[PDB]
């Protein structure tokens, strides 16, 4: 059982290659997750210069195997059950009245490090809009992440609506559609319907000259 890999603190590496309206960029990240607390801490650097999109729009792309599954729900932690071999995470993210991100990720162990490698593609964004015009506040809210099994794909289907606070007091919704399928052929837990209560907080390293993001996530499963 993959649950075993998560009983202590696990180091994490993150790598993302992106292209939004033709603007290419790369990000690298490191930190650690502790599933016993449901805690994740990560720092990201844009290695190509300036990030062409707002940092909060990439938060959900930048490892739900670090959720805390209460003991009575351990039967439904598909994320852990897929490791070490790992799992594919794909999303399409529809920004209300704007463009969309499509993403492709693999989350897996390489020895003692959990690795999350992402490709991201965004298109049809307005040059005046909240995203390309950098009108999102640098902050994040709480959301519920709804998980249901997908028996035919041997995986899960996931959906939620992220609320991005805009600097003029409006809110920009980002509608997430998500699926996850194992990478190995080992058996995986297909869960009953449930959700992950997700909270996050963004901040900055003042000793960091490069464009960057410090990310903190707290995630606990619920609904059973």
């Amino acid at each position, epitope marked *: 059982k993959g649950e075993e890999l998560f009983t202590g603190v696990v180091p994490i590496l993150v*790598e993302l290659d992106g292209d939004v309206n033709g603007h290419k960029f790369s990000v690298s990240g490191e930190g650690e997750g502790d599933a016993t607390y449901g805690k994740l801490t990560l720092k990201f650097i844009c290695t190509t210069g300036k990030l062409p999109v707002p940092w909060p729009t990439l938060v959900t792309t930048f490892v739900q195997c670090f959720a805390r599954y209460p003991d009575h729900m351990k039967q439904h932690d598909f994320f852990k059950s897929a490791m*070490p*071999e790992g799992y594919v995470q794909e999303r399409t993210i529809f920004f209300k009245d704007d463009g969309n991100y499509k993403t492709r990720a693999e989350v*897996k162990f*390489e*020895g003692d490090t959990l690795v999350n490698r992402i490709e991201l593609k965004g298109i049809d964004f307005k040059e005046d809009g909240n995203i390309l015009g950098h009108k999102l506040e640098y902050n994040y809210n709480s959301h519920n992440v709804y998980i249901m099994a997908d028996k035919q794909k041997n995986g899960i289907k996931v959906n939620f609506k992220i609320r991005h606070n805009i600097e003029d007091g409006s809110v920009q919704l980002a509608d997430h559609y998500q699926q996850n399928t194992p990478i190995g052929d080992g058996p995986v837990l297909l869960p009953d319907n449930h959700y992950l209560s997700t909270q996050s907080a963004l901040s900055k390293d003042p000793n960091e000259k490069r464009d960057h993001m410090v990310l903190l996530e707290f995630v606990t499963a619920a609904g059973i």
Partner: nanobody, 130 residues
């Protein structure tokens, strides 16, 4: 969207004991998913034997006991190659050298085992004469 990866070894030669040689492997296909690559070697009448492995993201390396301090594995993610630098070659290094790759994630201990890889090249011959 295909998982298939293809591996092409090169560089095997006939060489004198105490010489060095560099082998190279080229991966293509869904290289995005690669998580480890490795070199094994097989001599006639013998089981295939672990030589060296390298984790793909970080570059952590594992060497088989009988090449420790002589062989060096390294990989280049931009070119999707993994090279095996063999110094101080001995007649007993004579074998066909195979390149392999894994895409599933793993704990480190399974990487020495032939059964832990999803893709294999067709080998390149190394002969060491003394």
């Amino acid at each position: 969207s295909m998982a298939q990866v293809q591996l092409v070894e090169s560089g095997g030669r006939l060489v004198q004991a105490g010489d060095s040689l560099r082998l190279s492997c080229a991966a293509s296909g869904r290289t995005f998913s690669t998580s480890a690559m490795a070199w094994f070697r097989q001599a006639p009448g013998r089981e295939r034997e672990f030589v060296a492995a390298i984790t793909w993201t970080v570059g952590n390396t594992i060497l088989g006991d009988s090449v420790k301090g002589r062989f060096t594995i390294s990989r280049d993610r931009a070119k999707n190659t993994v090279d095996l630098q063999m110094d101080n070659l001995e007649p007993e290094d004579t074998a066909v050298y195979y390149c392999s790759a894994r895409s599933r994630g793993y704990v480190l201990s399974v990487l020495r085992s032939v059964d832990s890889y999803d893709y294999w090249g067709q080998g390149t011959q190394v002969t060491v004469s003394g």
